[PDB]
Design a protein around this ligand. Sequence first.
Ligand SMILES: Cc1cc(Nc2cc(N3CCN(C)CC3)nc(Sc3ccc(NC(=O)C4CC4)cc3)n2)[nH]n1
Length: 287
Amino acid sequence: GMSPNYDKWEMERTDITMKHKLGGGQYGEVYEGVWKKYSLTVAVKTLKEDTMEVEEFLKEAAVMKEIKHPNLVQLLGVCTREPPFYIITEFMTYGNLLDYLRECNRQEVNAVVLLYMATQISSAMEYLEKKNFIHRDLAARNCLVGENHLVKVADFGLSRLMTGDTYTAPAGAKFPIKWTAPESLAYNKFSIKSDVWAFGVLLWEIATYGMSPYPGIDLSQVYELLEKDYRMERPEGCPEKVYELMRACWQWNPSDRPSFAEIHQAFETMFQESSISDEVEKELGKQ
Ligand SMILES: Cc1cc(Nc2cc(N3CCN(C)CC3)nc(Sc3ccc(NC(=O)C4CC4)cc3)n2)[nH]n1
């Protein structure tokens, strides 16, 4: 018999040491912290006093208690009973994937590692796909990097458990044009298929080591271009099979886009073969 107000996810703020702010203010009020009890470094997202976004914060916290996967950043606890609200998650030492890609050593982050990243992400999405959840904000900036190129998807502020086949965002809502599928931009309609489209754009960010999508193109012209069947070109050095998958993710009709299960299977096979090849190449100097 547990105590009356026992809540398995709650923890006292005093258990956490708050340190420096992370993400240079780009990700809101998030700080690096330490869960003293375990001398564990953790990430802590908080909410400013006053704020008119408390509901959004609680929802984000709620969703994280519902998902668990090796490639989804893990919620460790929350402080949502009174005033300063906290969301505590495992710490990913290398930060967000976009900056990781923009500052990496390409000798280390090579062809094999890029496929490994996409394989890990598709794995997480296959999990969400089968749970019938939508992420709604897939982008390299929303993925994190740990030791040994470990990659996990994060930022579930818009993640939704779907009841139907689609989700209609409220009128007036604004979205990241470059990662947003046409049906979403035009009718605010989202589905696992719109996440697939987004995944295609994320593959492109990986392939280009973090370049911003649709180079030089004006945001106001993106939709018109897509409608005429324009799509970003194959990045220099990007394997043909990967670009094909990319193009499949950008099929105009959501029903024509592949499933994450299919995407994951494709990358798993490409990663394996590419990995083997890399190890055999190293073998050329040591047997
Ligand atoms: C969730 C999470 C985040 C992390 N790790 C990090 C690490 C990081 N770094 C800054 C730059 N150095 C060179 C490397 C480490 N910068 C950020 S910037 C950042 C901070 C927080 C969030 N997201 C949240 O707190 C969400 C999950 C509720 C996203 C990006 N996040 N581990 N776990």
